[PDB]
Design a protein around this ligand. Sequence first.
Ligand SMILES: Nc1ncnc2c1ncn2[C@@H]1O[C@H](COP(=O)(O)OP(=O)(O)OP(=O)(O)O)[C@@H](O)[C@H]1O
Ligand SMILES: Nc1ncnc2c1ncn2[C@@H]1O[C@H](COP(=O)(O)OP(=O)(O)OP(=O)(O)O)[C@@H](O)[C@H]1O
Ligand SMILES: [Mg+2]
Ligand SMILES: [Mg+2]
Lengths: 53, 189, 465, 28, 504
Amino acid sequence: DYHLETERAQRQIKQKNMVDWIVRNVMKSITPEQERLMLSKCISDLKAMSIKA
Amino acid sequence: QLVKAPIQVFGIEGRYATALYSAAVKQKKLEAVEKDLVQLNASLKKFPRLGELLKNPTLSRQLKKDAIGSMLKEQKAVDLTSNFLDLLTENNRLKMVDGVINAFKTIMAAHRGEVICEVTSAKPLDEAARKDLEVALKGFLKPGQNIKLTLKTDPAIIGGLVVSIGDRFVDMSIGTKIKRYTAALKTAV
Amino acid sequence: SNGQITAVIGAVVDVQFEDQLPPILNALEVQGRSPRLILEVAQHLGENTVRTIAMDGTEGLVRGQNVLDTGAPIKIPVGPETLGRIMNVIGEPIDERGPIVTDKFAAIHADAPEFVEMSVQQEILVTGIKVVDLLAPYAKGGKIGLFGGAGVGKTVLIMELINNVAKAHGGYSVFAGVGERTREGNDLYHEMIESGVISLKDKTSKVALVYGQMNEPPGARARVALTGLTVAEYFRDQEGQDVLLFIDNIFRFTQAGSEVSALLGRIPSAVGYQPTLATDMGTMQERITTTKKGSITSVQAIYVPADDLTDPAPATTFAHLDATTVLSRAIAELGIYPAVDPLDSTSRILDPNIIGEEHYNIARGVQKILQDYKSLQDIIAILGMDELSEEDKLIVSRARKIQRFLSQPFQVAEVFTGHAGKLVPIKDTIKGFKMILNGELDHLPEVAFYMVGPIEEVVAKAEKI
Amino acid sequence: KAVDPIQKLFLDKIKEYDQKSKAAGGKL
Amino acid sequence: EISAVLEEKILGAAPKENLEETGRVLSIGDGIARVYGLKNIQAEEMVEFSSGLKGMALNLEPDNVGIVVFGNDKHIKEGDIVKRTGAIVDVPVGEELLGRVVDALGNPIDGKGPIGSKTRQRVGVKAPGIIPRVSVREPMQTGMKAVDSLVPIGRGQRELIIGDRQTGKTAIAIDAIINQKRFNDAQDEKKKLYCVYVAIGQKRSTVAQIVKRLTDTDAMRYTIVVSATASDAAPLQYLAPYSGCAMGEFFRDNGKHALIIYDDLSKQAVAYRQMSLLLRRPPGREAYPGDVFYLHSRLLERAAKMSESNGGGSLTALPVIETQAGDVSAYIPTNVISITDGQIFLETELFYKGIRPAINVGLSVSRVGSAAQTRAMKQVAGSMKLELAQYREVAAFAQFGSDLDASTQQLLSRGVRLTELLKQGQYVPMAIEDQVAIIYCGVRGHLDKVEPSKITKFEKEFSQHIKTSHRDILDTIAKEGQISPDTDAKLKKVVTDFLSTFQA
Ligand SMILES: Nc1ncnc2c1ncn2[C@@H]1O[C@H](COP(=O)(O)OP(=O)(O)OP(=O)(O)O)[C@@H](O)[C@H]1O
Ligand SMILES: Nc1ncnc2c1ncn2[C@@H]1O[C@H](COP(=O)(O)OP(=O)(O)OP(=O)(O)O)[C@@H](O)[C@H]1O
Ligand SMILES: [Mg+2]
Ligand SMILES: [Mg+2]
């Protein structure tokens, strides 16, 4: 039970640490060329939903 | 007997608007009564003293109908809109003259079949963006339809596209998409 | 014509029609529902919009859903084909025995019979219950109410009346389960098929069951009593039969009306009830009567909320009943069953010219001793039994013997009590209370008078001690 | 069958975290 | 490992973007959001707000839709986007909820991960009718001596646990949940019973301590805890009994048997009164709405015993009602008494005297009665019920009875042993064979020489001797299903031997 709770405590802090690391890394990594590509994909997906009727 | 409106408008202000629409479509003055009502509403917005005068409950209704009549002769309103505003001042209903006009605008927009579209983007764009967005929005149109497009800018959605229709809505934006992904991270295990 | 749903708020649905409005109390049928959803028109709101009450659940209803006008009120099957069958508020069979194939239908909304079509004759209906047969006798053809709270015993009392009266009855019976337990409906249904009152094999059934229970929406619970009336009205009028109508319980009709009235946009009445409490009850209760064409003996269990007899729904029901049987919780906590209050139950046939001089004098003598006991009980509670030596102690001793002797074991309560059920003839009842009033049994212990029917079983129980 | 670019970016951040964590000997 | 789970959760949570019919919040306040739009929305359909809160479309009106918010109304502002879920209000159901603590919407709150349920069931399903039901004939073993003998509960019954505050209402309900471990561990699946504990308006610490008690006693493996505590919104406390009932109706409709506890329905009526008063509905008795009876009646009627053509399953309800100063004549308790199949009344006066559980024997009713208990228990508890009634009649003569008759003294002495017999410690439910043997010894006169202060110690030691030295007696009782006069003589001899061996 001690090893299980130690593993659970280490798993919980690693999950919390990787969550805030991913949030900070995703927010700090914003590029305009990828933003325009995602904008074009959103327009194409909107056009695909209009066709799907 | 009243002619059915293209869309249902609710409230007492919508009841007056449907009554005016039915009377104007039984005759052939649908386009005329829309033109002077828009010009009347533009006149009230451009001159706030008129709006405060009509909405004043202290003033007698004779002064209101004289002021309405004096400002409606310049509009060349003939029979329907003059009787409509006379009915509004006969009751105590001209306090929401903007309400009935806005409701009447909503009826006539659906008369032409126009559907309001609201597209929100993080940054403004044209040329390649506007060309494909018009065609994508036109794909939702049944025959006999028009697009009223309103473009908005908001940096709170990071990027992506938040496009809305008259009753339908999608949230294909970067800010909401990373939000549910982070929610999936916290609820993973 | 064809309407469309405008607003759905609980059990109340607003439907707007285009050409012609259906009249009030007309039945409307919603189209896109796999089971039948029936709307009953209640009022016209203006602008060709009617406000209706749904007879089933309103979940899954959208605004603009098409609603068809049937052109008539709720019509339910009536006749011999309903005997042995269970039907709901709208006449659909819920016994899983197929459709009710009949050519006769009747609207659940009907006018009460006029003043000319009234029967003034009153004859005593002997039950076999000593407290009922002595103090508040039931009339053979008349309205009987069973007032009581929760758990004081009204279902048991009305099941004993079915066991005693309805088994040996030359006619038809109708049971209207109105806002009660579905378990009790299953118990009563299997009791009928076991006692032979309902025959699943041939057409010798004698009782029709109509059930709208406490799991039903307020629209169904406020109209299922009318469906039981309509079956009983057909038997009285179109066949000239003498009909028994057991309603359990009629308070749920009024209670469901108050729940709908909150959504009908009415200013609430006293204790939050509907403004039309007395008029809706009066319209329903005046249809349950004996006319010159036929007779209806109605027994109606009446729930009182918070054990309050001054509540508007039981108070207005008191004037609709020939005989009232008020069940008390204080008597039930003393172990006296049935817990009928002797000083709160009336009959309207407790007359020397109807039930006899000796029956009337014994009943008035019993009530006089019990009223004297209630006056002395405040001295007994605080000070004690030391009062007036011989005189008041004899009053207390006789009254406590009478209170024990009013109790009686029921045949329907034999399962959970162990005491065998007793059916006591009314001659033995008045003889038994005359012996107690004359002082012939003052030497017996008062335990011997408890839970034994005849007075010969009292002396046999005393000798056993 | 094109995948979401945010999903690909999230997978890259997971791989970047895993490479840096293994280069740090399991430390935060 | 953790990276792989994190990656598969990202890939598995595809957005699946599509256009949804939406509305706009007009006004939010008092737990009711008025929403402009949603033309094709259904009545009682679940919605989603932009903040993630769910809501139920209560009022459909021509201009707006009134939505009951399942959460705090500080997360909703005017002008928000309200999306249709497309489905009437429903919760996850299944065996994946066993061992899990959830809220009123079915979302897990114990932090053990998501719920892998593949089925959902509406919370507003109507109760079964006359035909699919059948009589209640299978026993519900609460493990309590005073309950299982004097107020016997069956499978498919609604038994009310009513009393004042801090009288043991939760203790009875939790011990009934714990007691089913002996049936769930066995291979006889017809006696297996799943449990649903619904906590309405309680403290969240109290619910956590209950879950700890169920986890220590291993009773959590077959228990679902639906929690809508005192910090939760009134719509959540209103919805939670129906959510738990739907989870219990999964077992009822699939041939299994479930027990559900509503702790307590008096707090759900308070939450529903709050919703009704904030909706401007006309208050009635004690400011309650007129449909507060239909609030509990439509809930409890779903607890039923099904016929063999419907799988033979059942749902057993144990509603809890808290009275004020022992007033069972109040509005809400009288409503539930008129719904349920009998009540178990707990007394404050008996609780102060050390009698635990403080069950009022004379005021506890089981409308099902002896039809749903074993032959051995029914044969013995029938005699104990008569003897307790005899002791109750002559209890008034014990106040001044300095000189009393031998028959009356025997009745008083027997009743004292029987009253001390029904006492039972908390969290120790008893098997039905142990209950039958102990009640049989106290009802035949074996304890007339044993002092009433040593009955509980005699209960442990004599049962241990039976479980060790005279197991053939239990085998004969289990085979016969009752107590034979030959076994009565053998039990007389081993009692005399045991009392002589303890002291002589
Ligand atoms: N005649 C009787 N003899 C013995 N016990 C009785 C009798 N009548 C009632 N009881 C007791 O009272 C209980 C309540 O029975 P019953 O269902 O008739 O009450 P009720 O007034 O219909 O209550 P509810 O409001 O729950 O329908 C019974 O289960 C039984 O314990
Ligand atoms: N048989 C018993 N033996 C010993 N202690 C008991 C017994 N029954 C109850 N108790 C104790 O009495 C206290 C009150 O009981 P419990 O909390 O179960 O009552 P309740 O009616 O749920 O009160 P609440 O108003 O908090 O819901 C608790 O501390 C409990 O441990
Ligand atoms: Mg009843
Ligand atoms: Mg508690």
